[PDB]
PDB file of C-alpha atoms in Angstrom:
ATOM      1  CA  UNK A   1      23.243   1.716  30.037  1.00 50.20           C
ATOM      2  CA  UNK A   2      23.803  -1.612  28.216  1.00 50.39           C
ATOM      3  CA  UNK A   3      20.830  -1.589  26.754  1.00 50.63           C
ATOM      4  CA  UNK A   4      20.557  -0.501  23.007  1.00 48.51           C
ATOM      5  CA  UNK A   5      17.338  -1.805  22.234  1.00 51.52           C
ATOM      6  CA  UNK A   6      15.544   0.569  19.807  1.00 53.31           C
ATOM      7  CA  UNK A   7      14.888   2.150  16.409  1.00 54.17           C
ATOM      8  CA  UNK A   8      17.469   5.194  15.793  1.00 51.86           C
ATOM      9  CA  UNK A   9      17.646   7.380  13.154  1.00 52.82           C
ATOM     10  CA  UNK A  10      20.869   9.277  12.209  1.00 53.54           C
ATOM     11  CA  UNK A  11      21.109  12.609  12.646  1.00 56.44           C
ATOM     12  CA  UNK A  12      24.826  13.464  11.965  1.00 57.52           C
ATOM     13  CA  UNK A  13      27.655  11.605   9.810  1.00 57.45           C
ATOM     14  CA  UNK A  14      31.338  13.189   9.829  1.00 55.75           C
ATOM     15  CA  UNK A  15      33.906  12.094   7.504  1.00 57.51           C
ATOM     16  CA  UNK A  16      32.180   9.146   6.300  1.00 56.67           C
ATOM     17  CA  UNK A  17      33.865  10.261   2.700  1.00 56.71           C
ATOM     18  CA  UNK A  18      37.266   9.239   4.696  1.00 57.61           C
ATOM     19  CA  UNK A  19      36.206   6.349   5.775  1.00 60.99           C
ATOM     20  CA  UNK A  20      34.810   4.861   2.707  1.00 60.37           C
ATOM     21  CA  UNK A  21      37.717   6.471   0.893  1.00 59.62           C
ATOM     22  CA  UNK A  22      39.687   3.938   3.124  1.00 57.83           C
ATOM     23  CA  UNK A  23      37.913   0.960   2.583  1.00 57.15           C
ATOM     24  CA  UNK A  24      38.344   1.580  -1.374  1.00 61.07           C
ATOM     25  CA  UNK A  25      34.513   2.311  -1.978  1.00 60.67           C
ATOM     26  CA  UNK A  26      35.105   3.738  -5.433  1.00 60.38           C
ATOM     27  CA  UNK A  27      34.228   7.644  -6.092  1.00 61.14           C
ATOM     28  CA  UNK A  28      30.917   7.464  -7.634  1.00 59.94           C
ATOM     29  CA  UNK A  29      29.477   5.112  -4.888  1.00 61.01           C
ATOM     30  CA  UNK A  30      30.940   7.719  -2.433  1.00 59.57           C
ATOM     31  CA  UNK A  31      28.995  10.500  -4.284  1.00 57.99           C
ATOM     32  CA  UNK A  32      26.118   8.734  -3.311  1.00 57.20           C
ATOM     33  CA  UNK A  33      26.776   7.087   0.062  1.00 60.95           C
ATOM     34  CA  UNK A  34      27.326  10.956   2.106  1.00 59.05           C
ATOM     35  CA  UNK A  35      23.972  12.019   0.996  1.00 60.45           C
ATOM     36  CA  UNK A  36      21.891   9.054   2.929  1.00 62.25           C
ATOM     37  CA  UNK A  37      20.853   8.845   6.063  1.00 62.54           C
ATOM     38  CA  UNK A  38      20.336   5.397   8.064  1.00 63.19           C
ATOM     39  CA  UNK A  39      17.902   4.266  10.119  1.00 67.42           C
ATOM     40  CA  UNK A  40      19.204   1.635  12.631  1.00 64.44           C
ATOM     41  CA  UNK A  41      16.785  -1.069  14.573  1.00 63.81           C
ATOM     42  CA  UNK A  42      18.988  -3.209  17.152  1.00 65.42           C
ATOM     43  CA  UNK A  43      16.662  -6.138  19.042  1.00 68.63           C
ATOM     44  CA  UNK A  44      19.401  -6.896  22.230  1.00 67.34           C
ATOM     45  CA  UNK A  45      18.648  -9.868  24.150  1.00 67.56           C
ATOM     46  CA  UNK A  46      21.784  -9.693  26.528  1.00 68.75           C
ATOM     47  CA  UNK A  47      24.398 -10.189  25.104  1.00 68.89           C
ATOM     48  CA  UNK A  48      22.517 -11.336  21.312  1.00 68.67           C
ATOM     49  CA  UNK A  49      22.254  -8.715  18.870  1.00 67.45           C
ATOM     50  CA  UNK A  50      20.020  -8.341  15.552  1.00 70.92           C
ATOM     51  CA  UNK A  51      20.634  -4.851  14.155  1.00 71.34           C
ATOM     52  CA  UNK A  52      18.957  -3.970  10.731  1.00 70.63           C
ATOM     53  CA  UNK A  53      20.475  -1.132   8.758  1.00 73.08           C
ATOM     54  CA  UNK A  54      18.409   0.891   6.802  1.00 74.15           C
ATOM     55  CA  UNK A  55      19.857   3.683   4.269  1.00 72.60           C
ATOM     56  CA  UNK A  56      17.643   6.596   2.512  1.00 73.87           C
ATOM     57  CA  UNK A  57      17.701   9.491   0.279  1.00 75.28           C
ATOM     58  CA  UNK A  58      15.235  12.322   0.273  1.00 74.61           C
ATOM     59  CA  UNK A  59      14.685  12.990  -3.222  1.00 73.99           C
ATOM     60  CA  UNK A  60      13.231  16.238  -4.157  1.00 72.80           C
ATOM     61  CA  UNK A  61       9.653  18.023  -3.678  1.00 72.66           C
ATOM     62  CA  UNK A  62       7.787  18.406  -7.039  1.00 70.33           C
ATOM     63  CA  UNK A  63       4.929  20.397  -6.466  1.00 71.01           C
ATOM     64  CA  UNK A  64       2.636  20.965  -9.227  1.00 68.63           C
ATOM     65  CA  UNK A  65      -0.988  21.730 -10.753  1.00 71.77           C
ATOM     66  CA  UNK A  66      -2.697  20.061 -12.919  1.00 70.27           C
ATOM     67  CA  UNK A  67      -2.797  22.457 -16.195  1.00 66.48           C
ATOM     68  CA  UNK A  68       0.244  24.932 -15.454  1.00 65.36           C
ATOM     69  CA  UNK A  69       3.266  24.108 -17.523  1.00 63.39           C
ATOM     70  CA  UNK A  70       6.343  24.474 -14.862  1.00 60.74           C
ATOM     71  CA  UNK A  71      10.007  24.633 -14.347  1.00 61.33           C
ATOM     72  CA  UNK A  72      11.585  20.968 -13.705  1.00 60.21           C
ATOM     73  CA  UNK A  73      15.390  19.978 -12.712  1.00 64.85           C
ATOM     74  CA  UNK A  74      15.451  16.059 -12.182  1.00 61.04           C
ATOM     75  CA  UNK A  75      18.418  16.697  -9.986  1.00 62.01           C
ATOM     76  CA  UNK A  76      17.416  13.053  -8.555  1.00 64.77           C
ATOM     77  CA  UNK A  77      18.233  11.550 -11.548  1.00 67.06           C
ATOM     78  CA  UNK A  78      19.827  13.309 -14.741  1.00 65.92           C
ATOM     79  CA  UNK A  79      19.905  16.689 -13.570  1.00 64.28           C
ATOM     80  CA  UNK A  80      18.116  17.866 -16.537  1.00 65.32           C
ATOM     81  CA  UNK A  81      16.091  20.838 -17.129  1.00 65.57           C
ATOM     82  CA  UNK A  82      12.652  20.147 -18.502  1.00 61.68           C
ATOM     83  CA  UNK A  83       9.112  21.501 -19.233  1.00 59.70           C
ATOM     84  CA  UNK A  84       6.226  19.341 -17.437  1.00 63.14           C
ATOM     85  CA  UNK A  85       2.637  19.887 -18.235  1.00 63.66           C
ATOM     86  CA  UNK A  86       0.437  17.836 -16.368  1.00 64.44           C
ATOM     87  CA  UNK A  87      -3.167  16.761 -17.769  1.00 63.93           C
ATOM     88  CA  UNK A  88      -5.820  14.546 -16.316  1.00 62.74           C
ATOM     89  CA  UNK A  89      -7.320  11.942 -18.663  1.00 63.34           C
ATOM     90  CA  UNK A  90     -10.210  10.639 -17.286  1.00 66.65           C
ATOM     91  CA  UNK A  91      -8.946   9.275 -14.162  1.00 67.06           C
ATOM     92  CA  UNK A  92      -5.201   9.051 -15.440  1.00 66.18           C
ATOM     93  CA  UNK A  93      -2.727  11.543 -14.447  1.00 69.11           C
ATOM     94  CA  UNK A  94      -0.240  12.333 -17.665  1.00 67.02           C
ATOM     95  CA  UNK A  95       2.744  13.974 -17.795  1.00 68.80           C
ATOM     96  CA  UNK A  96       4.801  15.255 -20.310  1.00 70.30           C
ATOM     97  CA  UNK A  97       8.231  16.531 -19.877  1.00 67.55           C
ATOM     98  CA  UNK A  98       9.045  18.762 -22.790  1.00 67.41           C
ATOM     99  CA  UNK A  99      13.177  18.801 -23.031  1.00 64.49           C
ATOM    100  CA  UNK A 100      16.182  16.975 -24.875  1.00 67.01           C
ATOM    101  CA  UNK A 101      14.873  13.859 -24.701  1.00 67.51           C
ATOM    102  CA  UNK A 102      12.337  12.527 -26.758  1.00 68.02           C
ATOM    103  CA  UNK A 103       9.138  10.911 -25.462  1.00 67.87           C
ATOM    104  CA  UNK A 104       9.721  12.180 -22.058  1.00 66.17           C
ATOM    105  CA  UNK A 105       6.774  11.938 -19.521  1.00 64.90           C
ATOM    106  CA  UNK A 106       4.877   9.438 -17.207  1.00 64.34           C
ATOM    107  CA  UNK A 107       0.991   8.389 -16.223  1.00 65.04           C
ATOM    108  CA  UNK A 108      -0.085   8.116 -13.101  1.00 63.23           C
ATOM    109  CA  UNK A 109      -3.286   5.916 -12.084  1.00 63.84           C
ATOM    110  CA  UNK A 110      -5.166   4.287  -8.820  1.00 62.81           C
ATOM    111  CA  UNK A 111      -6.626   0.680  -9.209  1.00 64.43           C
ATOM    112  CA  UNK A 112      -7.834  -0.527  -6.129  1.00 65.76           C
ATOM    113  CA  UNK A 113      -5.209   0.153  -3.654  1.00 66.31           C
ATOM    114  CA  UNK A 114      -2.498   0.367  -5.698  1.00 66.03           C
ATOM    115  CA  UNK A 115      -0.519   3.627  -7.477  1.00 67.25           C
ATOM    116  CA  UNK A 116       1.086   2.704 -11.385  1.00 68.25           C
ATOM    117  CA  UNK A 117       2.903   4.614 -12.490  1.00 69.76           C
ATOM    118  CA  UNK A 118       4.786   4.281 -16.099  1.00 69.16           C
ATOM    119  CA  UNK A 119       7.628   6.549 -17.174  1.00 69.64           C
ATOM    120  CA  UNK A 120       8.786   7.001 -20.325  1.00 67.05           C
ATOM    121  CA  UNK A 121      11.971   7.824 -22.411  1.00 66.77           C
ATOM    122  CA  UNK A 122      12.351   7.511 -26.000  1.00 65.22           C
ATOM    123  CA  UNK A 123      11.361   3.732 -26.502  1.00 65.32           C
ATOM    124  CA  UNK A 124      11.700   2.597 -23.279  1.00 63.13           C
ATOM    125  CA  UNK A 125       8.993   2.308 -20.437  1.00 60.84           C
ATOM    126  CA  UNK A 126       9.541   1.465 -16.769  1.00 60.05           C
ATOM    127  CA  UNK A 127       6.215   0.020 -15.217  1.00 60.31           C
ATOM    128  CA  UNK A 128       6.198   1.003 -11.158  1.00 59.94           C
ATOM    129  CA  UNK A 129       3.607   0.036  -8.855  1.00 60.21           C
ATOM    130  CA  UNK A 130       2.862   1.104  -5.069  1.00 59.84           C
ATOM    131  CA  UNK A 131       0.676  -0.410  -2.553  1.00 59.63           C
ATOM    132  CA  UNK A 132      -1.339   2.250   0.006  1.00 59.37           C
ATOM    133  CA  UNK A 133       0.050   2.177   3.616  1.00 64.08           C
TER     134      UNK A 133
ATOM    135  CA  UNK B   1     -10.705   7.960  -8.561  1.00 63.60           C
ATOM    136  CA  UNK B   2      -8.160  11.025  -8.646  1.00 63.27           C
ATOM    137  CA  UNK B   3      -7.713  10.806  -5.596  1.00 63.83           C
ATOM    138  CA  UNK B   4      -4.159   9.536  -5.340  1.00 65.58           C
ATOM    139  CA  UNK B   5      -3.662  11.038  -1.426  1.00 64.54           C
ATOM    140  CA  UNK B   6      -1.625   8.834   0.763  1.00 62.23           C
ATOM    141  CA  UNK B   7       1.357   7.131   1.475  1.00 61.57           C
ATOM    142  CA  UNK B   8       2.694   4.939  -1.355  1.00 62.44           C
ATOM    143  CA  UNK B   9       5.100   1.690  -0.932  1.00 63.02           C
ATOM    144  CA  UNK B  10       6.790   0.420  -4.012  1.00 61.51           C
ATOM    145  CA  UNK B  11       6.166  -2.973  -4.197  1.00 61.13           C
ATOM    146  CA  UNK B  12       7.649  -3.394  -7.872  1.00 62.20           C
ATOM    147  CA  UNK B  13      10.143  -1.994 -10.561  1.00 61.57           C
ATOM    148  CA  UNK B  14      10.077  -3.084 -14.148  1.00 61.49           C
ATOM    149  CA  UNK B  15      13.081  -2.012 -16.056  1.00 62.08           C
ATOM    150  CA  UNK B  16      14.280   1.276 -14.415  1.00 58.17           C
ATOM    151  CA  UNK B  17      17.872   0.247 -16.140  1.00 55.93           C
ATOM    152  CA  UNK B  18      16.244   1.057 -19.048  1.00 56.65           C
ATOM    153  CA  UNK B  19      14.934   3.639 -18.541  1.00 54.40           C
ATOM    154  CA  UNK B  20      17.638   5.598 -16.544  1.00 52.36           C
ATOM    155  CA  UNK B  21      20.133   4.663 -19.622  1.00 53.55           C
ATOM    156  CA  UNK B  22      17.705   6.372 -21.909  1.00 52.30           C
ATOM    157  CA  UNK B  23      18.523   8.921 -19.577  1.00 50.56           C
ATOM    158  CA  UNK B  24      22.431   8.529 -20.051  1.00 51.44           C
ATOM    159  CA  UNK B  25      22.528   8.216 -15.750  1.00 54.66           C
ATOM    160  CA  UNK B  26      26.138   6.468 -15.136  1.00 56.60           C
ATOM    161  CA  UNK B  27      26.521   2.911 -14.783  1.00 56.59           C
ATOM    162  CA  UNK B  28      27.785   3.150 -11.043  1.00 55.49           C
ATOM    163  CA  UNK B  29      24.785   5.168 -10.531  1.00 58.26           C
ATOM    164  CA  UNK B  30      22.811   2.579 -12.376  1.00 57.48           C
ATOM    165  CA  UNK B  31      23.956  -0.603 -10.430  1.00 56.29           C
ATOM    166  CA  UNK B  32      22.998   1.014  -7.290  1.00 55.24           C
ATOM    167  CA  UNK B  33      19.228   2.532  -8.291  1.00 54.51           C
ATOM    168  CA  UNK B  34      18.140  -0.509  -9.206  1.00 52.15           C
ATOM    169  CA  UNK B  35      18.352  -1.808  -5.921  1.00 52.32           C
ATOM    170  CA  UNK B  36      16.434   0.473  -4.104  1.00 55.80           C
ATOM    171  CA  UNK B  37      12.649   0.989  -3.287  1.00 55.42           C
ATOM    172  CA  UNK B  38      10.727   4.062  -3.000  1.00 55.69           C
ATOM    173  CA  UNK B  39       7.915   5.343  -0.489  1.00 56.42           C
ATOM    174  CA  UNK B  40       5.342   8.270  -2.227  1.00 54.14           C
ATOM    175  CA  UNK B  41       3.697  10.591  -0.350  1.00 55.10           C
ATOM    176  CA  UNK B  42       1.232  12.799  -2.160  1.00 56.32           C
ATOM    177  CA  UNK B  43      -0.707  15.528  -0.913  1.00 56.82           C
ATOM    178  CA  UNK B  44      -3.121  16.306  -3.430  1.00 57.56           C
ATOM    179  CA  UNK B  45      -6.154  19.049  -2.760  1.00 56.14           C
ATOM    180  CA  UNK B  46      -7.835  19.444  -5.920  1.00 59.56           C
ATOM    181  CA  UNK B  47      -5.577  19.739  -8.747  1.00 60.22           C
ATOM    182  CA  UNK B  48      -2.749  20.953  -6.954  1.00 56.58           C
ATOM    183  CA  UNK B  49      -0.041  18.424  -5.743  1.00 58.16           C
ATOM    184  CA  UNK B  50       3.198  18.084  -3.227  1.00 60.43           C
ATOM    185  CA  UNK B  51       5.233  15.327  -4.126  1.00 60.72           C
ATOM    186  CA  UNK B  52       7.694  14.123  -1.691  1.00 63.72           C
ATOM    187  CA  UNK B  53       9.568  10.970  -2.515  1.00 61.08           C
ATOM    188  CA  UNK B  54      11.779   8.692  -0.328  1.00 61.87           C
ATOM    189  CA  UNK B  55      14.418   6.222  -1.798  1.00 59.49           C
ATOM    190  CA  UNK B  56      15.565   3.509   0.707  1.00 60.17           C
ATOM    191  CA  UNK B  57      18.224   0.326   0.655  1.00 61.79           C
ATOM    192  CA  UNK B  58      17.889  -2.131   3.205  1.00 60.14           C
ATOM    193  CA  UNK B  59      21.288  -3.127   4.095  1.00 60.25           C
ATOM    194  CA  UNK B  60      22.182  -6.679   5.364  1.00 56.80           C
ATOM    195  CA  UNK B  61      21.061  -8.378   9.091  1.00 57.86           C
ATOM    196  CA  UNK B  62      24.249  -8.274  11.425  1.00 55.18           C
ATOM    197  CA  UNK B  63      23.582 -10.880  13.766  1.00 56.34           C
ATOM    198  CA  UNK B  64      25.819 -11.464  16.835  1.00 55.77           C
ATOM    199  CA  UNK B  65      26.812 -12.576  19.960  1.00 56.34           C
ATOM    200  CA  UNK B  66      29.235 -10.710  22.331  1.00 53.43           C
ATOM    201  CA  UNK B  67      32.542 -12.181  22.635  1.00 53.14           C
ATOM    202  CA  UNK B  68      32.068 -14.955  19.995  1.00 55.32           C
ATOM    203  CA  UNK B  69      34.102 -13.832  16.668  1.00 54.74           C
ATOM    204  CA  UNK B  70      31.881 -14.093  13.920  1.00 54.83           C
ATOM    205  CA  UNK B  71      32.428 -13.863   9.685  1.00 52.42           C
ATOM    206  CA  UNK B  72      30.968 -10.512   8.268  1.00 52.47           C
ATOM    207  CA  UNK B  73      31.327  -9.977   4.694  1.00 50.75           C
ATOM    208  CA  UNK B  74      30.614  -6.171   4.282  1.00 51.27           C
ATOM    209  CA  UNK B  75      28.378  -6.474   1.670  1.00 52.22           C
ATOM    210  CA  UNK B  76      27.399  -2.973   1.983  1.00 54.80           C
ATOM    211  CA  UNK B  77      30.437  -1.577   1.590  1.00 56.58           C
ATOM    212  CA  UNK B  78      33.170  -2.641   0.799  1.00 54.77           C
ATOM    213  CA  UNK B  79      32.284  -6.331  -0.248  1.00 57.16           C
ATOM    214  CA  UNK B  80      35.057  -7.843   2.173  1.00 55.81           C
ATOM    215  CA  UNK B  81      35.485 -10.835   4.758  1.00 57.46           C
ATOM    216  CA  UNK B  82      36.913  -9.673   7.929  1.00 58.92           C
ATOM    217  CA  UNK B  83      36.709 -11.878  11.535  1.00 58.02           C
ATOM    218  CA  UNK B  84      35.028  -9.942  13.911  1.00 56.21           C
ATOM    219  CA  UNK B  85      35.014  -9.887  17.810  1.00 59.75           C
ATOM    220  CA  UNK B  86      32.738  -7.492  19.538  1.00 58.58           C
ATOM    221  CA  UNK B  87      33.499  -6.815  23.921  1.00 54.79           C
ATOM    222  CA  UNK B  88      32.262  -4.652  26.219  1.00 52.80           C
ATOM    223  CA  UNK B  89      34.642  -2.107  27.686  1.00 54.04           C
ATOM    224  CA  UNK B  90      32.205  -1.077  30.336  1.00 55.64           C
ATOM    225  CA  UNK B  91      28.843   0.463  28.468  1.00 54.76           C
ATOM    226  CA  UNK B  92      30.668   0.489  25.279  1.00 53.26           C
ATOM    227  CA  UNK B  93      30.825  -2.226  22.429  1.00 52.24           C
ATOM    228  CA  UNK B  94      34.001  -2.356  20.963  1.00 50.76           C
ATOM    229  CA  UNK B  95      34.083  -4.503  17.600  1.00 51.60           C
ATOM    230  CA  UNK B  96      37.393  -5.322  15.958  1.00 50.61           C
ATOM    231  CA  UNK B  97      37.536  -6.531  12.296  1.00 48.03           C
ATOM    232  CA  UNK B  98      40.582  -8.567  11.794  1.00 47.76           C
ATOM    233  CA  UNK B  99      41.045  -8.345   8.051  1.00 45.80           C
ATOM    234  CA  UNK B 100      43.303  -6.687   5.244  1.00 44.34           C
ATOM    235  CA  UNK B 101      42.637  -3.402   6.744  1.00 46.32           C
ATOM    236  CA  UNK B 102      44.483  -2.259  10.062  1.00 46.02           C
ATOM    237  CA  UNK B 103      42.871  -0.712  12.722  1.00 42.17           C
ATOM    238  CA  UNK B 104      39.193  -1.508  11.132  1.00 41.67           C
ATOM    239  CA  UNK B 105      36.031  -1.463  13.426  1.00 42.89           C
ATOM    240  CA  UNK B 106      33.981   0.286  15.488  1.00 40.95           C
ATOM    241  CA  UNK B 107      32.423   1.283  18.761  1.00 39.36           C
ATOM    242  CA  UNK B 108      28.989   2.377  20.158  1.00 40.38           C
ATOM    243  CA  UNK B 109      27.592   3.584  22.904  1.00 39.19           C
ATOM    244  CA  UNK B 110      24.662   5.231  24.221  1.00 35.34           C
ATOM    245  CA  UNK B 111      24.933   8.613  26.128  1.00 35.15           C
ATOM    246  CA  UNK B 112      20.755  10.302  27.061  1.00 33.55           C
ATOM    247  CA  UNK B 113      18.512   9.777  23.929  1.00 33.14           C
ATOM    248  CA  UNK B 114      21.590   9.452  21.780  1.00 31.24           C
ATOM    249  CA  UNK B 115      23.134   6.180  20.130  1.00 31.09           C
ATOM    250  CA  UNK B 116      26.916   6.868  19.278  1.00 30.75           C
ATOM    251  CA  UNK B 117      28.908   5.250  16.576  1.00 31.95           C
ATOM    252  CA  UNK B 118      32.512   5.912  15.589  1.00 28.34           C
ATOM    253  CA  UNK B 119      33.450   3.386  12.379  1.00 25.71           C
ATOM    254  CA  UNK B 120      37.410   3.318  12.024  1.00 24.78           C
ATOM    255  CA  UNK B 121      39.774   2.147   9.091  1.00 22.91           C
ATOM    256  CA  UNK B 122      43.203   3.100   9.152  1.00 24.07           C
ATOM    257  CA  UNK B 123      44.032   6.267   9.946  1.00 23.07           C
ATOM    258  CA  UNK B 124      40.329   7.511   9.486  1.00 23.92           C
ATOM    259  CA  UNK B 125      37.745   8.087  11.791  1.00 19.93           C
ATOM    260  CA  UNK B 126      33.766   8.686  11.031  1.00 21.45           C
ATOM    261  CA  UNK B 127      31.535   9.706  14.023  1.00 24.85           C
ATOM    262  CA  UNK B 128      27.518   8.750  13.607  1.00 22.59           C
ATOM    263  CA  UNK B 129      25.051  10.209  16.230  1.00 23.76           C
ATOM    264  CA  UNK B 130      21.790   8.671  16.339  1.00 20.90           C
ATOM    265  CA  UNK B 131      18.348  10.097  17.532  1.00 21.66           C
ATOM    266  CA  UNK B 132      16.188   7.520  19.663  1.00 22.08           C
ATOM    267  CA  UNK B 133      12.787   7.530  17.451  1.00 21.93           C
TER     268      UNK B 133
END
């Protein structure tokens, strides 16, 4: 068949590291690029295509209860080994990750139907915020 | 509520440079995080939690037409112009980038439930197999 119409999601990616590597994609964008995996959605119309590329990582479970200090290595990020202790105030969810870094942790809150969250590292904050699917 | 259950959609990122240089994450790794946009998905009974978090770039729209040679600049990649011309050879879609590099471009076909894709530069060769979903 002709007919590619569809969403498709990739399930196996060989020497994409030569390829890039080829096309002069530099190393540390190459570290990155052969861990995603795309998600392609082609709209044919005979011989018209729209195809729109999307690429994702899996970052990694953190499973947790509230109260129990645990184990954490943010591998998705700076591969650091850290404390976490999470604590419920009132309705906020806190977290502090007890490691090199100063002033390590994040908060965690619903507000309608929306998820903030706020991390924290030494003196700077990033402010997040999700909408409920 | 605690109750943050669900499926969670970023819709917004305030200073996650900052943040990730606080964390002393690489400026290639940098330039790329802040581009993408993450999808939560807690399971929370009680006060325990699961945690699974997806990171996703959308790459560019490739709109075309068969047999009309188009521009493509390959944003997603390697950032360059190239003239390409895609044919069918039979059920297959051939796609030649005339550019700087020799022998760039790709073909794809489908073969059952399976979308194939083999992206060449050079003397390299990468072979994608997609999944219908």
């Amino acid at each position: 068949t002709r007919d590619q119409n569809g969403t498709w999601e990739m399930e196996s990616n060989e020497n994409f590291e030569g390829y890039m590597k080829a096309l002069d994609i530099d190393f540390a964008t190459r570290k990155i690029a052969v861990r995603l995996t795309q998600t392609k959605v082609i709209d044919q119309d005979g011989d018209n295509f729209k195809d729109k590329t999307t690429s994702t990582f899996r970052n990694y479970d953190v499973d947790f209860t509230v109260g129990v200090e645990f184990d954490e290595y943010t591998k998705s990020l700076d591969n650091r080994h850290v404390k976490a202790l999470v604590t419920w105030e009132g309705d906020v969810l806190v977290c502090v990750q007890k490691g090199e870094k100063e002033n390590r942790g994040w908060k965690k809150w619903i507000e309608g139907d929306k998820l903030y969250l706020e991390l924290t590292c030494g003196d700077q904050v990033c402010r997040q915020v999700f909408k409920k699917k």
